[PDB]
Structure formats: structure tokens, C-alpha cells
Amino acid sequence: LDKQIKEIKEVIELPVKHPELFEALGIAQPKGVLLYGPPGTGKTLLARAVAHHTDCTFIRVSGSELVQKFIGEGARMVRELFVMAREHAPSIIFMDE
Amino acid sequence: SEYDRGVNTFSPEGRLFQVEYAIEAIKLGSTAIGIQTSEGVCLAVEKRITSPLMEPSSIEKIVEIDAHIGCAMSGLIADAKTLIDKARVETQNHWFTYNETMTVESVTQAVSNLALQFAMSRPFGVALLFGGVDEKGPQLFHMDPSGTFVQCDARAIGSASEGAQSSLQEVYHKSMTLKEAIKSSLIILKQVMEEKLNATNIELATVQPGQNFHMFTKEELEEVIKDI
Amino acid sequence: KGVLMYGPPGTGKTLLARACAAQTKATFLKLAGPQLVQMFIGDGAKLVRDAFALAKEKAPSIIFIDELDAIGTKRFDSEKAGDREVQRTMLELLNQLDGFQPNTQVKVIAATNRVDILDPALLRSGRLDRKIEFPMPNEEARARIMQIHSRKMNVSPDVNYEELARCTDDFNGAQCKAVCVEAGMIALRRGATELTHEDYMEGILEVQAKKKANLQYY
Amino acid sequence: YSRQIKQVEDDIQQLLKKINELTGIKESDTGLAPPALWDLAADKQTLQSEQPLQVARCTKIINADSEDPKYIINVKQFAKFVVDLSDQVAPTDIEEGMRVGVDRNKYQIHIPLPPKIDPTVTMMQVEEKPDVTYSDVGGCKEQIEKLREVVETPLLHPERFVNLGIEPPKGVLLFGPPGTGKTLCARAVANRTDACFIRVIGSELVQKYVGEGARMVRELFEMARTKKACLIFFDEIDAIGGARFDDGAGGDNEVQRTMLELINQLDGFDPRGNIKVLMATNRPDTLDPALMRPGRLDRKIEFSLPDLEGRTHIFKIHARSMSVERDIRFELLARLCPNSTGAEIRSVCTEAGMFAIRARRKIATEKDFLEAVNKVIKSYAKFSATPRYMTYN
Amino acid sequence: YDSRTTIFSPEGRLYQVEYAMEAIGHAGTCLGILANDGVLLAAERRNIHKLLDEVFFSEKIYKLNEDMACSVAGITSDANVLTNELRLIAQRYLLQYQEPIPCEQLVTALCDIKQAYTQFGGKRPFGVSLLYIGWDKHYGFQLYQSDPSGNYGGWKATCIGNNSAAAVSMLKQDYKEGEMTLKSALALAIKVLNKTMDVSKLSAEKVEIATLTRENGKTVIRVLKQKEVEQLIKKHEEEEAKAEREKKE
Amino acid sequence: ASKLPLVTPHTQCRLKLLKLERIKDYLLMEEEFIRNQEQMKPLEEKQEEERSKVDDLRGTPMSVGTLEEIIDDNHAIVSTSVGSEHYVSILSFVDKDLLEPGCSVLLNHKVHAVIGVLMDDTDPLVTVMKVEKAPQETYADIGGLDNQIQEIKESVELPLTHPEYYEEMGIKPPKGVILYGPPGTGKTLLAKAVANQTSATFLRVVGSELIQKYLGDGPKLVRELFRVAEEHAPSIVFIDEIDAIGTKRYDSNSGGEREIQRTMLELLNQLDGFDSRGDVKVIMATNRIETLDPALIRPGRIDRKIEFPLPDEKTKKRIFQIHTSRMTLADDVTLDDLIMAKDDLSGADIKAICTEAGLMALRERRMKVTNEDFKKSKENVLYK
């Protein structure tokens, strides 16, 4: 997946390790990345391996209610995740279809 | 829902509400005033101009039904066009068949007959004021989009109709001359128009027992504007 | 065993519950409709068994519930959705009134304003016996009811009540009371003694509550 | 003097900021008031909270008993048991459905028993009247008088009704055009009242669980009947119940139970008596006929759109404050907006004032009101909220 | 009993015509280029499968008459009905007038009848778009594009494909004005179908090309043979061998 | 606090010198009397030893209770954490002013009497709903529109910066404002710009998360949302994509569109609550405005409606100059060709184009963009 790993290294870690590289061009750092293809086709493991290589806290949420008690007492919205997510500022957001 | 206004649905109580909506829609138009006197019948409308680009001559409401009967216009003008055309042709074929001139009541009854007929699917957004002279003298008939035609000696229709009708109740009586009636009508029109009265701001017409349908007294009405 | 009365709500039946309360010298228990709806699970079952046990305790006694169509809603088959607490409440209600250990000591009185909501299980044949409809007050009952309610007024000897009930049709007991109370209202508005006969009719146009519309061209 | 202005005041106001702080040495509360007033009774009247009065926690009465008292007491869920409490009050204040202050070993009576209710309904009373009157509500004068003789003479002198032997009407519905109407005159009613004015908004009664709304309706009726007379306001009853239309799978039953139980509560079996209630909605055609029954809906105040005179009067009402060149043409303004609602008219005067304050003017003109009305009624004419709601469909 | 589907939008547009537009948006792909010596039209036929008989002789191409030809995209059934109507009206013109219709009069007749179809009746519009290529004595070779909305115009080279605007953009960036050069126009179509279609290697069993040219007062209309199509294709991919030679420089 | 308001003279005058001398002498007698109260009446010391005696009377732990009712005379019923409520007494120093139902109270451990009120340890969702810092550049960043900017300054910014004009107007500033138009024209950013400009507290949540998994939780959610809005400051509240609540259906909700309607009626109440609202301002933004219930849009609930048109080409070149300002561009590029490169393009489109050109230059480690970068950018960004 060599072209794919090339472009994902272009998209996520360059605006982590070298923000001045983007400041040298004056372009906004990307925030949202879409991965698509047939299921069981080099996704989730790629995301996890990138997060491990980049020393970023890999987080994923399925919307289950087991994990709900780990975020808030009711946590009726989803944005609440940020007040703990920003406590691990090298972090990456992922979830399934 | 939309099935409520399908074609013909009266009310939870009372008559058809869509013709009542035509009744409230008739107030979204320029006013008109009509006075029936023994000396003659006077009609007056507001041009309601919006800019000095278009010519006021094309801004036409009052038309000639025939040589002794005229009428105003109100509400939707294109709705009025069909009724005026039919009234003209029925008067003409009535003269053709009956070698005479008719009463205003016949024309008023005819347009009342067409008014209910549903061009279909809605009543016409127009209220007319037939005026003229016949064998029994001066005549002035009021017509509504519900079709209930009725005779009136003095009337105001359109927007601001009820305040003008109140002033008519204040000032109109039986033994008023034609000049007096015209002056009173212009006075009331002056106090109900939002803009200053100009030469082409309004329009006037009259019907006399002697003369035919008058040619709108154009460029003579500045005499009866400047004096007052 | 088991009486149910039904009909349109303006028809009047409640008053018969108060009257039969007034007439018997026995223990009388009353229930609201959804009074047996609790989210402590089976608490309504406890309420049912407790109420009927207390009813059993007083051997001369009758049990009345108003407005059973809250609980008597027909059961149904569905997935991922559907209320089921009221199924337990209705089932224990039906069973304890009829089923095992039949008993003839209390009589169930059952009010509702509609019938097709009701589950067939409760209205089956003997779980309730007498189904009675309230007819619309046809022509003389209206005059009788307004006479009853205007009994507390100093009625002038010019009234024609059957004339009123003829000109005021399709009106039930509640609006029939509304006639006399708003007649008293308009009488106090003008300021006088008790009304005359015609003074009721300007009340009735208030009662029917017609939409205001300047429709005179008739 | 001008740049030297800042040399006299500072020498004293900084000193002021020193001594005011030096006096301000009773602060940093985090759960206190000024202790010279918070602990103003920091003397022994603190110790008498300890030795004279002891805990006396809450309780719940269950059942009475013959002869000697021996009543049965619930705590909340702790234990369910039978004692005689004490003897300092006569045994006639004990009725089921009440709460005594009861100890754990001595079980002292302490105080008589008040009822327990949700704090939400206690919060739900507003105890504040908005500064709106019966004068600043114009365009609905006959609607005004129709509600005047509902919430006045029963609250005022009852000797007229007693003398004529007529029970006053109870169930009154007030309704009008959508958006302009019942709400602000309801604030006026709450302004002119004297007894309690219990608010009810219909959307809040729905709960996560089933049947709780019945419980809070019962509680609010109980706390209402604690008063001699009290006013009840209902808003948007369309959501709190339409009709019983159930088919197949259960649909909207959870609110149906609430609406039907309040219907049971309003009529039959010793009703509230001297409690005046009133409801206002947005669409009347969808309400249930059983709720529409008189005895719960006796009067039918219906507000419409004002023809001309109400429009002129509201033009008077909202526009006694803005600067104008004396003369006005408010009646022709009303003629310019035939099918226009009251809040729309106030918006027109608001935007006229905004056009006046655009560059530098202080008094709006007649053409400024024209510039208001054309960009209100016939530039925002696309939505206007009127046409599908004048049919109330 | 609830079907209006004839009224304007609350903002002014029509829901039906825009639904028709995005229905054409996911349809097949066909493109055409005008030239001074003639006109070409290239399409990819969809549902390319091994079990097709392929006995219709370029079914996506419909010879409206001996002079002017058609191509369609959208619903095949509505396309059949519409093309039959085009045959009917064109040959009614030939019956009334003993000469071929030039190009545009039949286009205007179609636009009129489809406007009447989207004016009243309360029926669904025909979600078909058509390309018209022909010859006349008045303007030589003439090309028109009829959208289902009723609007039409005289684009020199255009398409109604699933990537319509893409090929329009490459045509706009890479068109030479007034140069017939029919071989270069074929190469232009080949590279456009190369870059636009998601599939690669440009299988001649996936595409069809038709040509129209004036010859001896007859305006001969031909369909390129499979061998000719693959020869032109292979010449196209061998043409891009020198493009990837600058690399470093 | 709250000494005296006077800023009228602000000059070398006896109208300042007199005031300052009188107030400093008032502080002088205040100081002299408080010196009297702990010199010939020190008791022990009477300042913190009384506090020490209270703190001794205060129990060491907190049997925290929840308040449910009030009785005036120094006692009430409080509910314990385990649920067994008590009718304990209160303290004289229990500062009986900030007592409210449902609030935490410090009680004793032995007699559990109401010792004091407990300050709330913040709140979870007030942190989530409140935007902390200013996002980005102010009104110099938009460009092109220049008309709705003045309008929204007049309706929102002008009441705060100039709270004088309406006073001589004797008029009320407009309350409810809708932003609408085709998507991508700059509504939720115009939102960002006005968030940057303002000094008042700012609230933001999108309508999409107003759906919830039970009955009544949506209306309740709106209730304490506006409660937080009122209880902090003069505040501006921003809701984006309201139309989602009417357009996109879901299955996670217990109730269907019915509970949606209940939430709608609650928020219609909330915009025109007959209770005293105050200085809370309301800003909306929604592309699909026609699907909304029009009674939400009414005057008194919504006063302004602002259309956001597709940008003009003279505005397009302004956007080109604005966004490409900080980046290094070669002379081979031209903005004018890219102006009409798409007939229907938005302000998001040009930013996406320039960012993709930036990353494409980053592919070959190049610092300056070239024309072919945009020529390959256009089909990647727009054309799919």
C-alpha cells in the first residue's frame, strides 16, 4: 500500500512533527481524512499502525453504551469526548462504517 | 393539509371560505369611489404609480362598458379583463338582438351570473362598480367576487374602503349636485391618498343623461383640482 | 357481573356514578384510569390485587373505574417497540375480575368514551356483562336538563323550554349546563334580575362558538 | 490641567482602595455570607440547634389502629414498622399520605405532617409578574373583556354570583392567530392577578419513563388545592394531547395517558372547586373532543387578525417612544399592511427605527416607515408563517 | 390519491427538472466533436458482458434519417419512445416538404413537445438527454444538445456523460478553433475517454465510435469497425510514449 | 463592593476633590469604628476565633444532602445521599440566601444539621458548550459580501458597543436572526468572525445532536441549555444546521418525528418565553430554510432574515487575493482564469483548491505553486 502510506504520511504527521513546514507555505493543516474501499481491506490496521508509529493516542468509538460510563454520567452529546481527548493532545479520531 | 381547499368546501360553519379569501384579497388593490346623482354618475380611481418611467396612460382601470355605461376596476386587473370583455360583447349582442340599449341591472346580473361559474378553479379577484344611465335614470350597482350584486347610491371599494364609506356617510345626501358630488369625492380622495395629488395621480370619469360616456375629462380636471 | 357504559363524552354517565354513590349504603371504591401505571415493575399488579382484596374485605361493596380505555388498549404483536407494562396490568385486572377463583361479592363498573380501543379480552362475555350506550339527548331531554340546571334561578314565567331544545339541537348535557351558566354571565353583564326567555338565546351563540365572519349577503 | 487631570484623584482613590479592602476583611465565603451577618447569631443560638432539637428525620404514615395509637410508619425504604410516636399533640393530625419528623429510637412526633411533592412543581410557580398591563394590549378588546369576566369577579367579590345563585365558568380556552395573541395577554393576566399563577408548558410533561406526568399532574392539583383559589396556565396543549387514534403498534400512548388522566381530574368526583384553569394552543382542530367538552372548555375566546382599528391602536401602542416630525400617517400604514399581525407591526416599527439610526438621523419619517413596511411585509413575504396556519392545518 | 408533481418550487425552480438532471447525471456516457470536414461521436456502451449477442449494430447510435443522427442517455424505454417520435416528426417534414429538415427545426419541435410534456398533464417528464449531429446547406455541419429540461444549444463539442463537466473542462482547455483535422479529433476523443472513464487500458470491446461526413451530396454516416477502433486505440496509447520523456528535464 | 458610581467630572475640580475627600473621610470613620469594635470590645479577638468556633461546630466531613423543600425558621427537610431524607435544623451561619432546591449542602456528620451551602464544582456540559478562545481573523477576513456584515454588526455588535443610540431612539434592538442561503457561502464562519469580534459569552451547538435516545430529554436539554445561557452573562447563542432536525430521520431515538415535534414546541416556547428573558441574543444558520416550521421564523421570535448569495466574480477575485495572500505563488499562475473555471463554485471550493495545490507542491518539496498545480487541483477537488 505504498502510495497510500505515502499520502497518509503526507496528511497526518507532517502537520504534527513539522507545523512550520505548513507555516512556510501558509496553508491550513488538514483535519478530516476519508478512507474507503471494500471491507476487510487494509483499513483499521493501517489507522492503528499509523497511530502507533506517530506516538498518537489511538482512540475509536463505536457508539456503544458500555463505553458511555467512561466518558460522562449521561454524556448526551458526543462533543464531551474532547475534554478528555485534549488531555492526550497527540491523538487521532477513528471509527468504523 | 391540501385536501381542505380541493374545489368546493364550505366551512366548519358558514359558506365557502375560499371566496371569503377572495373577499379579503380584494383589499389588496387601489381604491375606487362612485356616486350616483340625478344630475349624473361620477367615478374615480387611483392610478397608483410607482415611478416616472411608465406612462400613466397605460395605467388603466376605468373602461367603457358602452356609450352610456362605464365601470372601474379593482383587485387583479387581468381578472377584470375577461369580465369587461364579456360584458362588452353581451351588451353588443343584446343591442343586436333587441335593437335598443339595456339597463345597467342586466349587465350587472350577467356578470353576477359569470362570477359563480367555476377559467375555473377560483373566484375572480375583482370587484366592479357599474355606473351609467338608463330609461329610469342614473344607476350605480356594486358587485363582489361572491357574485351578490346590489344597488348603491354612493360607494367606495378597494383598500381603505370603510373609512371612505364612513366619510361618505358623513357628507353624502340626496340633493347634491353633480359638481358638488365630484368636489366631495375629490376631497375624500385627497384625504385618503398617501401621495400628493398630481395631474396623472388619479383618474375620473362621469356619465350624464345628455352626454354619452365621457372621455375621462383629461386635462380639464386640473381646473377642478386647482380651484379646491 | 360487570357493567360498562359508553358513549360520546358530552353524553353524561359520571353523574350516574355520583348518584349511585349517593343511593347505596355500602362501601364504594373509585379508580382513576391510568392510576395503575407505575415503573416500579409490577407495582400496578400490586395495586390491582390490593384494591380487589380490600373490595373483598367489604362484602357489601361495588368497584368502579372511570375511563378504562387507558388500560384496555388492544394487545398487539410487534418487534423492538411496544408498551408492555399495561399488558401486565390489564391481564391481572381481567384475571382477578374473571378467571380462577370466581367470586360474587363486588361489581365492576366501567366507563369509557370510545369502544374500539378496548381489548376484546376484557369485554369478552362475562368479564363484563351489561354494555349500555348513552343516546344523544334527542329533543325533550335537553329541555329537561336545562330546566334541572336552571332550577337555581328565578325563572320568569315566559319560558318555552321545548322551543329552546328545538332551536338548540345536537347539544349534550355539558353544553346544556353551559347554556345556563353563560346566560347568568350575560345577565350579570347587562345587570338585572334573572333572565327572560329570549335572554337564553344570545347565550347559545356563545356556547356553540361560531367562527366570527361578516357573512350577511344571504 | 487636562493632561494634569490625572494627579489629584489617584492620590485619594488608591488610598480609598486600600482602606475599603482593609475593612473588607470578612470575605472569601465559598459557602458563606458576611459572617458579621452570616454568623450574626454565632452565639449560643447555635448550641440550641444541637441539644434541644435532635435530627427528627422524615417518615411516612402507612396505617392507623384501634384505641391506643400504635400507627405504622415507613421511613423511605429503611423499615416498615409500628410504634406510638409520642404524646405532645392530640392524635387527630394523623392521616395516610403525610410525613412526620420521626426519630430512630425515641420516635418523637416533633411537628405536624406536611405533604411531600416534587421540587420541580415548586419551582414551576413563577412568583413574578411581567410589566405588561391591560392597556398595552390592543386589537382584541372583546377578547379582553371575555377574559376579564373569567379571572376577576370570582377572584373579587363573590356576592354577585351568590346572589344570583350562579356558579362561575371554569374551563376557558383563549386562542388566536399563530404567534401573535394569547401569550402576552396571559402575561398581563399574571400581572393583574393576586393569587398564585401556576405555569404549565405542555412539552415538559413528557418524561423518559411512563406515567410520571400523571404523578406530577396529581401533585400540582394537590398543591393548587392547598390554596383557596389559584390560576393555572396551559401552553401548547396540541403536543400534550391530540386524540386517541391507536392502530396496530402503539403510537403516542405515553402522552395519551397524561391527557386522559388530566381529563379525569378536571371533571367528576369532587373537582378542584375554586381553581381557575385556562389553556392556549397553536392549532385547535387537532384537540381531543373529550378535552373539548364544556365543563373543561366552557368559554372559547378566539382572537383574529385586526381589521384596521386594532392595527391603528397597536400602532399607537408600540410607537409612543420614537422620534417623528409630529405628524404621522399610521392609518395609511395600517392600510398598507392589511393581513398583518401584531408582532409583525412591532417589527415594522423596530426596523423603521433601525433605518433612522442608519447614518445619523434621530427622527424617522413617513418614507422611513414605508422603507420599513416594504422590506418587512412584502420583502419577507415568502414565509410569513400565516397561510398554512390561518387554516390551522 | 396524492400526486401534484407539476407545481413550481417555493423558491422558483422545479424539483422534477432537477431530479431529471441528476438522473441523467448517473446515466451512460456519450460525447461528440464537430469538425469542418465532418462530425464524430464516441460513446462507451454500458453493461458490457460476455453473454450479449451484440446484434443491433451500435444500438447507442440511432440514424434519425439519411443525413442526421442521434444519441441518447437516460431511460432506454423513454429513449426508444422519444427517438420514434423524432423519426415520425422528421419524416412528416419530409412528407410536407420534399427536402431534408436542416438540423435545428426538428430540435425545436422536440423542445416544444418536451416543454408541453413538462408544462401540464400531471405526468412525469422523460429523463432522457440527446445529442444531434447533422448537415445542412444553411450551416454545414451542425451539432445540438437537448437536455430533458427543454433547453438546447449549439455546442461545438460536448457530452452528457456521468463525467460530463470533466470532459467539457478538458475539451475547453484543449480545443483548437477552426481546425477540422478529423484524425486529431479522434485522438482527442480517445484521450478524453481515457482520462474520463474510470476503467483503464481502453478496451475496444467497451467503446463505440460513429462518424458523419458530407460526401457526393449524400452525407454518409458510418460506424467504425472493431478492427478500426482498436487500431485507433492502440495508436493512441503508443502516441503517449514521448510525453513521458522529459522527466528530469 | 458597590461603593458609588460617579465618573461625571473626571477633571481637576472640587466636583472630584470634594467627593474623594468626603468618601475617604467616610472610610476614615468606618476604620475608626471597626478599630473601636476590636479594641475595647475584643472579647477574645472576635474576628477569626468566632470563625474558629463555627469551624469547630462544623463537622469534619460532609454528609452532603440534596435540598427539596424550604421552611423559613432555621430548619427544613433535606434528602441524604443514600435516599433516607432528614428534617434537620440549619445553622445560624448557614447563610440563608443562596439556598435553592436540588443544591448540595454541607450537613453535620452526627446531627446532620444544615451547616452550610456548597458551591457547585463546575458543570460538565457548560465546558462543552462554551467556546473558549477567539477562533480566527475578524471581519477583514470575509471579503466580497460587505452588506450582511454591516447588518449583523447593527443587530448584534452595535447594541453592545453603542448602548446609547437606542436610548434616544427609545426602541428595542432586534432579537432573532436567521442566516440562510446555499451551503458553503460562509454562514458558520461568519459565525466564526462574529465569535472572534464579540466580548460576550458565546454558546455553540449544532441542531444535529438535538436528537436523543429517550422521551422528553430533548426539550429538557434545550431547557438547561438556555438556563446556562441566562445564568452566565449577556450571551450570544449559535445553532447551526437546524434543518437536520426536520430532514434526517434516525432509529436511535425512542420516539419518531413525534418527539421531534415536542422538541420543536419546547423551543418555540423558549424563543418567546413569557418569563423574563433578558439580554440573551440569538443567531441561527441554516441552508435548507424552507423545510423549517415557519412559525419559528416569526417576528418576535425572529426579526431578521439574511440571504447568502453565490459569490460574484469580483467577490471571487477578492477571495483569491484573501486566501492566497500568505502563500508563495509564482508569476506563472493567474487568478482571473480560475475565476470562471467553474460556473458554480463556492468559497469552500477555492480554499480547497489552494490547499490541494499547496500539498501538491509539497509532494515535490517545492515552495512555490505553479499553474499546472491548479490545473491538476481543479479536477481533484471539484470533479468527482
Ligand SMILES: Nc1ncnc2c1ncn2[C@@H]1O[C@H](COP(=O)(O)OP(=O)(O)OP(=O)(O)O)[C@@H](O)[C@H]1O
Ligand atoms: N393587542 C395587541 N396589542 C399589541 N401587541 C400585541 C397585541 N396582540 C399581540 N401583540 C404582540 O404579540 C407579540 C407576541 O404574541 P404572543 O406570543 O402573545 O402570541 P401567541 O398567539 O400566544 O403566540 P406565541 O406564544 O406562539 O408567540 C408581542 O410582540 C405583542 O406586542
Ligand SMILES: Nc1ncnc2c1ncn2[C@@H]1O[C@H](COP(=O)(O)OP(=O)(O)OP(=O)(O)O)[C@@H](O)[C@H]1O
Ligand atoms: N466567501 C468565502 N470565502 C472563502 N471561504 C469561504 C467563503 N464562504 C465560505 N467559505 C468556506 O466555507 C467553509 C465553511 O465555512 P462556514 O462555517 O462559515 O460555513 P459555510 O461556508 O456556510 O459552509 P458549510 O455549511 O458547508 O459548513 C470554510 O472552510 C470557508 O473557507
Ligand SMILES: Nc1ncnc2c1ncn2[C@@H]1O[C@H](COP(=O)(O)OP(=O)(O)O)[C@@H](O)[C@H]1O
Ligand atoms: N494488506 C493486508 N495485509 C494483511 N492482512 C490484511 C490486509 N488487509 C486486511 N487484512 C486483514 O483484514 C483484517 C481486518 O481488515 P482491516 O483492513 O484491518 O479493517 P476492515 O475490516 O475495516 O477493512 C485484519 O485482521 C487483517 O488480518
Ligand SMILES: Nc1ncnc2c1ncn2[C@@H]1O[C@H](COP(=O)(O)OP(=O)(O)O)[C@@H](O)[C@H]1O
Ligand atoms: N341530566 C343529564 N344528562 C346528561 N348529562 C348531564 C346531565 N346533567 C349534567 N350532565 C353533564 O354530564 C356530565 C357528567 O360527566 P360525564 O360526561 O358522564 O363524564 P365522562 O365524560 O368523564 O364520562 C356533567 O359534567 C354534566 O355537565
